[PDB]
């Protein structure tokens, strides 16, 4: 009964899951949070244990003691680490060696906060589990098949050639996992196929998958580009930002905080980054929440259609992520916004809750199949780890 421990270190937290190799089902999940004076560990969402001014190593030894307690330690056959940004260096998941680590550090200036937390998790896990093989899965690697016409910014070439300024894209692990599930669900030939995947969660992005490969995506060098999101602006006119700076004497630094933390659904609505709250507000007559949601919809539609340009044929549009999986209303309003693509909704199918899992929501006359496919990044990570567990290292 081997298991895979999957580790995701964020700015201030370590999320983990333990996956049964046989079912790839989750056996245990948890978080060490406020990594702050108030650091705590909650497992299966329960009884926060207090951690000190604990660093990532201490917190992971804690998680490791929780596994020891449950007699899982010796079952840990593989450990998979989620890495935020792999640059142009990583095009697929890898066995972690010293070389891999040095290379993660090399790309780390592209996502300074996140990648340094990912490296702390790797260091801690290597120290705690030296005889277990560990694997790195990058949230950017699926997008490394974009052609330069799709990844270049229209900035001077030197920004690309000497600083790595280009579109990278994110949610790679979700877009990959969902597109693979789509070839089955839609019965498409992977090698002759065109899909658009809309990952709509707290972060949101669109990916165009042509013949199995990502050929366009909505997020940029950073996760700020593309779709408007919960608290993130999405696409914003650089001119407008510069004009706002001059007009308010905000520095680039102020503006960075605004567009990340105060914008999007929260910024428009004045109310919440949470979609269910904004729907309830709209039901109660709140016009700015209505407008926040309409705008969110419009931007999704606009990106889905624009990503279709990278395809030779459009076979399917797939919704995923917390919003994409659960919002009956978002889906319907997006699809109605894409009538120009010949889409038809089956409103019976569309009303089904997410307990129904992988499901077709377009009606028979539709020109493009529409579906909902729940994403499972943990599983995708465990699958790569299992595969890499068969090789010599």
- 186 binds its own copies, rule: CB under 8 A: no
* Half-sphere CA count of 88, side-chain side, radius 13 A: 13
Question: Is the Cβ of residue 63 or residue 300 nearer to its own copies in the bound state?
Answer: 300
Alpha-helical (H) ranges within 216-286 are 238-248, 252-261, 264-269, 275-283
Whichever of 191 and 312 has its CB closer to its own copies, that residue is 312
Burial 350-368 (b: 16+ CB within 10 A, else e): beeeeeeeeebbbeeebeb
Q: Does the protein bind its own copies through residue 74 (CB under 8 A)?
A: no
Among 2, 34, 164, 201, binds ligand ANP (CB under 6 A): 201
- Among the listed residues 32, 67, 323, 382, the single contact to ligand ANP using CB under 6 A: 323
Instruction: For residue 356, give both structure tokens.
Output: 């129904």
**Which residues partner with 317 through β-bridges?**
196, 370
Backbone dihedral angles phi then psi of residue 293, each to the nearest 5 degrees: -65, -45
| Residues numbered 129-168 forming contacts with its own copies, rule: CB under 8 A | 147-150, 152-157, 159, 163, 165, 167
Q: Does 327 bind ligand ANP (CB under 6 A)?
A: yes
Query: Does 55 belong to an annotated binding site?
Result: no
Which one among 111, 321, 345, 382 touches ligand ANP, defined by CB under 6 A?
Answer: 321
Q: Which does 110 bind (CB under 5 to 8 A by kind): ligand ANP, its own copies, none?
A: its own copies
CB-based contact 388:368 (threshold 8 Å): no
Q: Quick check: 192 binds its own copies (CB under 8 A)?
A: no
294 binds, among ligand ANP, its own copies, none (CB under 5 to 8 A by kind): its own copies
Count of Cβ atoms closer than 10 Å to residue 101 Cβ? 15
Q: Is 237 exposed, middle or buried (0-12, 13-18, 19+ CB in 10 A)?
A: exposed
Nearer to its own copies, 234 or 374 (CB): 234
Is 103 annotated as ligand-binding?
Answer: no
Q: Tally the C-alpha atoms within 13 A of residue 156's C-alpha that lie toward its C-beta.
A: 4
Q: Which of residues 348-377 bind ligand ANP (CB under 6 A)?
A: 375
Total residues in contact with its own copies, by rule CB under 8 A: 82
Q: Which of 139, 216, 315, 384 is flagged as catalytic?
A: 139
On the 0-12 / 13-18 / 19+ scale of CB atoms within 10 A, 48 is middle
What would the two tokens of residue 35 be? 């990594």
* Known catalytic membership, residue 46: no
| Binding-site residue positions for Mg(2+) | 8, 377
Contact residues toward ligand ANP (CB under 6 A) are 201-203, 230, 274-276, 321-323, 326-327, 375
| Binding-site residue positions | 8, 15, 82, 171, 199-203, 274-276, 322-326, 377
Residues forming the active site: 139
């Amino acid at each position: 009964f081997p298991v895979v421990l999957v580790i995701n270190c964020g700015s201030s937290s370590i999320k983990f899951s333990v996956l049964d190799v046989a079912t790839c089902d989750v056996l245990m999940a948890g978080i060490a949070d406020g990594m702050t004076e108030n650091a705590f560990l909650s497992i299966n969402g329960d009884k926060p244990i207090n951690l000190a001014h604990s660093n990532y190593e201490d917190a992971l030894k804690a998680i490791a003691f929780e596994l020891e307690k449950r007699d899982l330690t010796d079952s840990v056959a593989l450990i998979g680490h989620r890495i935020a940004h792999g640059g142009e260096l990583f095009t697929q998941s890898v066995i972690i060696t010293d070389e891999i680590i040095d290379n993660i550090r090399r790309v780390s200036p592209l996502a300074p906060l996140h990648n340094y937390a990912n490296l702390s998790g790797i260091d801690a896990a290597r120290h705690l589990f030296p005889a277990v093989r560990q694997v790195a899965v990058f949230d950017t690697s699926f997008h490394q098949t974009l052609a330069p016409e799709a990844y270049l910014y229209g900035l001077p070439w030197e920004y690309f050639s000497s600083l790595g300024v280009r579109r990278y894209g994110f949610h790679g692990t979700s877009h990959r996992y969902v597109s693979r599930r789509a070839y089955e669900l839609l019965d498409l030939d992977e090698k002759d196929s065109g899909l658009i995947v809309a990952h709509l969660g707290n972060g949101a992005s669109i990916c165009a998958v042509r013949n199995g490969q990502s050929v366009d995506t909505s997020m940029g060098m950073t996760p700020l580009e593309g779709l408007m999101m919960g608290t993130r602006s999405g696409d914003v006119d650089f001119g407008a930002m510069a004009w706002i700076a001059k007009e308010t004497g905000q520095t680039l630094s102020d503006l960075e905080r605004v567009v990340n933390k105060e914008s999007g659904l929260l910024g428009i609505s004045g109310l919440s980054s949470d979609l269910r709250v904004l729907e309830k507000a709209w039901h109660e007559g709140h016009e700015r929440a209505r407008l926040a949601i309409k705008t969110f919809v419009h931007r999704i539609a606009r990106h889905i259609a624009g990503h279709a340009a990278s395809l030779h044929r459009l076979d399917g549009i797939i919704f995923t992520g917390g919003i994409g999986e659960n919002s009956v209303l978002i889906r319907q309003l997006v699809i109605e916004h894409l009538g120009v693509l010949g889409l038809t909704l089956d409103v019976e199918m569309n009303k089904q809750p997410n307990s129904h899992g992988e499901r077709i929501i377009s009606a028979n006359p539709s020109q493009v199949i529409c579906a909902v496919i729940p994403t499972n990044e943990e599983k995708m990570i465990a699958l790569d780890a299992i595969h890499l567990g068969n090789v010599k290292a």
